Amino acid sequence: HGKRLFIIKPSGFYDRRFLKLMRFYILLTGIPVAIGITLVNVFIGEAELADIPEGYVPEHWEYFKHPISR
Amino acid sequence: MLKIIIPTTMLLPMTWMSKHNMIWINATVHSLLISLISLSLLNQLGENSLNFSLTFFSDSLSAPLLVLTTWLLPLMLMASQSHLSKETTTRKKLYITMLILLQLFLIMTFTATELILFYILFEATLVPTLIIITRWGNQTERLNAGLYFLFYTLAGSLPLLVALVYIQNTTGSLNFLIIHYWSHPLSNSWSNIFMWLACIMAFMVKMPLYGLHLWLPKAHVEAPIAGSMVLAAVLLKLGGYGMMRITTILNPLTNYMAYPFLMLSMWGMIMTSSICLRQTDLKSLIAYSSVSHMALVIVAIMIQTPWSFMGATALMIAHGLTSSMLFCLANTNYERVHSRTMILARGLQTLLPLMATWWLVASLTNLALPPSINLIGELFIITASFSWSNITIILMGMNMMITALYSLYMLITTQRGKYTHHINNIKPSFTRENALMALHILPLLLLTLNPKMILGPLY
Amino acid sequence: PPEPTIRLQEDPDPEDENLYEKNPDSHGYDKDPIVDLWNMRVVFFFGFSIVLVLGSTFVAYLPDYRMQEWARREAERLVKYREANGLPLMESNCFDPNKIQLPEDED
Amino acid sequence: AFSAPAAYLTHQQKVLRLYKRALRHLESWCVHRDKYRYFACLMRARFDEHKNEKDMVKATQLLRQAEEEFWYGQHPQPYIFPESPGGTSYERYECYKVPEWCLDDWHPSEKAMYPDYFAKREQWKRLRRESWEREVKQLQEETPPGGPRTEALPPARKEGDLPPLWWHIVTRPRERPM
Amino acid sequence: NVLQIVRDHWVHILVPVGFVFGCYLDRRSDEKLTAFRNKSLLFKRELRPNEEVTWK
Amino acid sequence: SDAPPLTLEAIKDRVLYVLKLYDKIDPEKLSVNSHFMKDLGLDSLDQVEIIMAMEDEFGFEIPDIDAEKLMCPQEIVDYIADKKDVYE
Ligand SMILES: CCCCCCCCCCCCCCCCC[C@@H](O)O[C@H](CO[C@H](O)CCCCCCCCCCCCCCC)COP(=O)(O)OCC[N+](C)(C)C
Ligand SMILES: CCCCCCCCCCCCCCCCC[C@@H](O)O[C@H](CO[C@H](O)CCCCCCCCCCCCCCC)COP(=O)(O)OCC[N+](C)(C)C
Ligand SMILES: CCCCCCCC/C=C/CCCCCCCC(=O)OC[C@H](COP(=O)(O)OCCN)OC(=O)CCCCCCC/C=C/CCCCCCCC
Ligand SMILES: CCCCCCCCCCCC(=O)SCCNC(=O)CCNC(=O)[C@H](O)C(C)(C)COP(=O)(O)O
Numbered sequence A: 001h002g003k004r005l006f007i008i009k010p011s012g013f014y015d016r017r018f019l020k021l022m023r024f025y026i027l028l029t030g031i032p033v034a035i036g037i038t039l040v041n042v043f044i045g046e047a048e049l050a051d052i053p054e055g056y057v058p059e060h061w062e063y064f065k066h067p068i069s070r
Numbered sequence B: 001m002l003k004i005i006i007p008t009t010m011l012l013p014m015t016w017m018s019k020h021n022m023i024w025i026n027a028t029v030h031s032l033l034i035s036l037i038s039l040s041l042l043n044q045l046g047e048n049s050l051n052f053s054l055t056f057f058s059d060s061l062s063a064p065l066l067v068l069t070t071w072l073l074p075l076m077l078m079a080s081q082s083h084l085s086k087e088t089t090t091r092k093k094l095y096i097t098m099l100i101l102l103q104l105f106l107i108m109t110f111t112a113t114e115l116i117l118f119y120i121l122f123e124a125t126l127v128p129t130l131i132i133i134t135r136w137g138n139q140t141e142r143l144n145a146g147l148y149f150l151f152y153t154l155a156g157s158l159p160l161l162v163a164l165v166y167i168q169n170t171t172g173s174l175n176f177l178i179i180h181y182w183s184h185p186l187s188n189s190w191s192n193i194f195m196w197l198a199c200i201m202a203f204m205v206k207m208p209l210y211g212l213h214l215w216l217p218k219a220h221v222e223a224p225i226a227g228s229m230v231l232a233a234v235l236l237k238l239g240g241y242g243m244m245r246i247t248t249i250l251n252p253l254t255n256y257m258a259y260p261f262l263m264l265s266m267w268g269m270i271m272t273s274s275i276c277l278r279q280t281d282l283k284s285l286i287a288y289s290s291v292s293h294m295a296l297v298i299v300a301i302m303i304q305t306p307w308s309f310m311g312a313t314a315l316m317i318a319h320g321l322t323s324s325m326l327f328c329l330a331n332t333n334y335e336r337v338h339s340r341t342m343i344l345a346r347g348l349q350t351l352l353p354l355m356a357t358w359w360l361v362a363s364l365t366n367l368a369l370p371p372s373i374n375l376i377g378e379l380f381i382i383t384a385s386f387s388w389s390n391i392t393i394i395l396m397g398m399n400m401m402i403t404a405l406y407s408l409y410m411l412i413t414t415q416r417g418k419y420t421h422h423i424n425n426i427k428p429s430f431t432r433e434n435a436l437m438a439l440h441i442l443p444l445l446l447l448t449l450n451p452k453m454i455l456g457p458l459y
Numbered sequence C: 001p002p003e004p005t006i007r008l009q010e011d012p013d014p015e016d017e018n019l020y021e022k023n024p025d026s027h028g029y030d031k032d033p034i035v036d037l038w039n040m041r042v043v044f045f046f047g048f049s050i051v052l053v054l055g056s057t058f059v060a061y062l063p064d065y066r067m068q069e070w071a072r073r074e075a076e077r078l079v080k081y082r083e084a085n086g087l088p089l090m091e092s093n094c095f096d097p098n099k100i101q102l103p104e105d106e107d
Numbered sequence D: 001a002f003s004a005p006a007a008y009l010t011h012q013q014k015v016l017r018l019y020k021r022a023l024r025h026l027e028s029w030c031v032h033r034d035k036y037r038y039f040a041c042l043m044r045a046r047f048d049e050h051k052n053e054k055d056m057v058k059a060t061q062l063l064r065q066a067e068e069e070f071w072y073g074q075h076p077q078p079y080i081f082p083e084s085p086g087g088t089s090y091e092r093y094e095c096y097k098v099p100e101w102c103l104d105d106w107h108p109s110e111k112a113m114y115p116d117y118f119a120k121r122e123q124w125k126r127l128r129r130e131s132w133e134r135e136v137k138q139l140q141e142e143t144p145p146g147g148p149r150t151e152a153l154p155p156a157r158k159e160g161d162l163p164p165l166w167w168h169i170v171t172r173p174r175e176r177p178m
Numbered sequence E: 001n002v003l004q005i006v007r008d009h010w011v012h013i014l015v016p017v018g019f020v021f022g023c024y025l026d027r028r029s030d031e032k033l034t035a036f037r038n039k040s041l042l043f044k045r046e047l048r049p050n051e052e053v054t055w056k
Numbered sequence F: 001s002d003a004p005p006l007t008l009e010a011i012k013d014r015v016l017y018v019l020k021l022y023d024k025i026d027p028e029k030l031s032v033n034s035h036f037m038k039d040l041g042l043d044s045l046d047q048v049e050i051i052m053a054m055e056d057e058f059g060f061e062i063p064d065i066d067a068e069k070l071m072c073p074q075e076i077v078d079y080i081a082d083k084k085d086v087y088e
Helices: A013-043 B002-016 B023-042 B062-083 B089-111 B115-124 B126-135 B142-171 B176-181 B190-206 B215-222 B225-235 B237-250 B259-277 B282-303 B306-337 B353-366 B373-388 B392-415 B431-447 C033-060 C068-085 D011-029 D033-048 D056-072 D101-105 D108-112 D115-142 E006-030 F008-020 F044-058 F073-084
Strands: none
Touching: A013 B353, A013 B431, A013 C033, B002 B023, B002 B089, B002 E006, B023 B062, B023 B089, B023 C033, B023 E006, B062 B089, B062 B225, B062 B237, B062 B306, B062 B431, B062 C033, B089 B115, B089 B126, B089 B225, B089 B237, B115 B126, B115 B142, B115 B237, B126 B142, B126 B225, B142 B190, B142 B215, B176 B237, B190 B237, B215 B225, B215 B282, B225 B237, B225 B282, B225 B306, B237 B282, B237 B306, B259 B282, B259 B392, B282 B306, B282 B373, B282 B392, B306 B353, B306 B373, B306 B431, B353 B392, B353 B431, B373 B392, B373 B431, B431 C033, D011 D033, D011 D056, D011 F044, D033 F044, D108 D115, F008 F044, F008 F073, F044 F073
16 A cells, blocks of 8 residues: 655654764774784783792782783 | 873863864863873772872772763863853853863862862862852852852861861871871860861761752752763762761761761751652752762761772762763753753653663663662662661661652653643754763763772772 | 833843754754864764773773782682691681780789 | 633533433443443433423532432443543553654755655745734734633634644644654 | 964874873982882892892 | 554445434435434434444544534544544
């Protein structure tokens, strides 16, 4: 049936534009950060606890486990 | 600590030497950059503190407040950008200058190794707020509101200066570190009772206490949106920070002394939450909700247990963000309607759906829905009060229920139902307002992932 | 009564101005479209892109200056030692009584 | 709902309204059709007995006394039509009723779709602008001095005239917009 | 165009200059609190073969 | 829903159907514009019973103020069409 009637509703263009802009910026910064974190975890991360050698004193950033924390 | 202070000072020449149509852009960008700089302070230790120098130190009670104070300025600028459009460049620059000075005073207040410096900055924050309220205010009662706000504060704080100078004359130092390590018991004496009152009432008036809360509805209703934001988000927390800092010297006198205040706050939270039910104004309703939350914070500080302090810190941060968001929403409604009364503009969910979603999220986070930090502070304070006395819960219970009621009431009166037929100037919500709400709400839901970051030094 | 019924010479109250009428895609920032768009971009980039993302990542990966894993390892080693010795875990007294000099009552 | 109200209700209006309420509540009491028909005819017959009564005081005595009886047996949970002010779907679709002026705020990219609709809307806006200017004068001249006495509006009397205050009656959203 | 956008965009440089100046001032103020360096009971340490101060 | 889009023809047909099953009126004498008070000699109570039948037929009830001033099938059809937003 060709009884298609017009639906009066407020303009959703601005809400969609704001949502798209927010998603675009958040992803624009988060996707590189997520990729970098994954590469760091897979390739470099997860140092394992050891014993301090005699006569050697560690530096301040050598007492942490995660590479990004160090 | 100067790595934060100096950029804030440089914000002033940058604003005053800015091009006539680039002040807002320059101010927002550099404020956000300064906020990013402030994030470094969050990495606290389980040891004493972050003592930068003889003048300024950092603490995990001071660090969240500093971060919130820095984060608030871009939001205030974005909120103020709207209604200052028909205004000359000089007066807009003066407004931005006042906001920058307020931030600088708050930043120096929160570090403040010495109590007299803390008092000086604590009262220096008063002038920019008074000028903002009494200058860029719409109604004719802004003068009376400014007078109330000034004189309540000064009547509360004038005995505090005398008490502080007396304490330094006797003890010999007003430094926080020295005071904590050399704290000695206060004998239950009339002079000690009055010293306790002078030390406590100044911070009690700014919370504010239920007896002394009158200035706040006037100041919140009559101030512009930036003024309301800074009053609800940061300026109310100064009293709580001051109490947590100064209470150490007060013991063991606090137990006997605390009863009048504990009763006033436990009954005043109920009174103000009930007042919220019958209100014809959005701003007054938000102000009374703030009064109820700060009464609960007063109870937490007066109980003076570790869980009390963690709950008070979390509740202060959460309330600051939530109340700033609520005032922003009310101002967005007002800028379209110009009435600032709930019952006039109705059914706004049909016309503005995303703004209705923002309203729902703000009302839910004001309602203390878990696992938001609002309920984290709520529950920590409630548990501490229950350990203090098993009867307090009953009052707390009522409070929670009443809170939910008026929150959803504010959600139902303005968003649900049928839109008023006559109003036709309700234009679609701008990107600026939606960004403002998003920047208000995202930090709360990010912080609920890491609650320890806002739980204070007793974590 | 020849009074003009006008208290003073006053400008009429101006009507509110819409940013959408003279400029669609008005972003609610400024009446100038270029400043408008650039203000929107800088707010979005320096708020959502820089602060909310990089700052959250920085706070998430903060080093253990609170010493939580340090405390856990200390407690683990301490309990490992105490169980073996047969010592009764944690002592009631926080300080050793031999180095505390009580005042004698003689009442 | 459409017609203007009167300054009062006459005796016959009151008796008709009481008849309507009583018959509806009896239908609510009598679920089945035959029982309802029998009792409704019995009630109609009882009602018609006092029809030719001429005493006004007696007329006042009648119906008001019946109203007390109606109130006693008023079926505390009567049947209500779904869309009636007490129905289960009274205001289901009020949330879908969007005003027409909202279309004036649409983005041009949205107005690119549905161009014929907006052209017809522009014709409607032109017609409204002319007709309202005519209607102001027409209502000013036709209204009685000292202010209107009854909230009923007069029709149009000329050729090109339109009914006064017509824009917001013609442009109702719909009963079921979505 | 250089020497033209500078006259309009010169203001941006001020906040970062303030930040670096504040960092320098913080280090300089730190330099005046070295009376107990490598003297705390918790961290008495013997200097490395090519070390002069434990922290700067 | 799955409700057919009823039209003016259907409304008028159902109105005249209900009126013809009203045995107080002989079917061959009534018409679309036939009055109730004078053209058919019906009581006001008969008119409100007609309103009852209409309300029970169309599934919605007419307010008393509008109902008490409806005297023709044609104007009843027009009113119900206005209520239901009927196109043709
Ligand atoms: C208006 C909105 C709220 C504003 C803030 C209100 C909170 C401030 C109120 C102060 C709380 C009480 C002040 C003093 C409390 C002392 C304890 C006392 O009440 O108990 C008895 C005290 O007895 C009597 O109370 C004596 C004092 C009576 C005179 C006080 C006036 C009472 C009502 C005045 C209220 C007005 C307050 C506001 C003024 C503007 C105990 O007997 P005693 O063992 O012997 O004294 C113990 C104390 N010693 C050891 C130092 C000696
Ligand atoms: C739109 C619809 C949804 C689309 C998206 C779908 C994807 C959903 C995923 C988003 C949330 C779902 C839950 C998943 C959680 C995983 C990430 C989580 O595990 O990381 C958290 C990390 O989050 C941070 O801790 C909290 C965020 C920091 C908040 C600071 C605020 C940002 C500054 C802005 C200004 C501040 C304003 C307020 C002043 C106080 C907790 O980390 P933690 O378990 O601990 O340890 C991490 C590993 N370590 C041990 C190596 C360290
Ligand atoms: C509403 C706030 C609560 C008010 C409760 C009481 C209100 C009634 C008091 C009105 C003002 C009274 C002024 C005189 C008070 C005298 C108190 C006093 O002198 O004690 C000083 C005491 C000991 O004196 P010395 O002689 O040096 O000791 C040697 C021998 N032991 O030393 C001190 O502690 C000095 C501290 C200053 C005391 C503060 C005086 C003002 C009253 C306290 C504040 C309470 C009112 C706050 C106003 C609230 C408005 C927001
Ligand atoms: C289930 C719940 C119980 C409810 C209880 C109800 C009680 C019913 C008994 C009430 C008794 C009466 O009749 S009440 C007595 C009221 N007085 C009169 O009726 C005098 C003149 N009658 C009129 O004027 C009418 O309009 C009329 C001529 C009928 C038609 O008028 P039309 O020609 O303009 O249609």
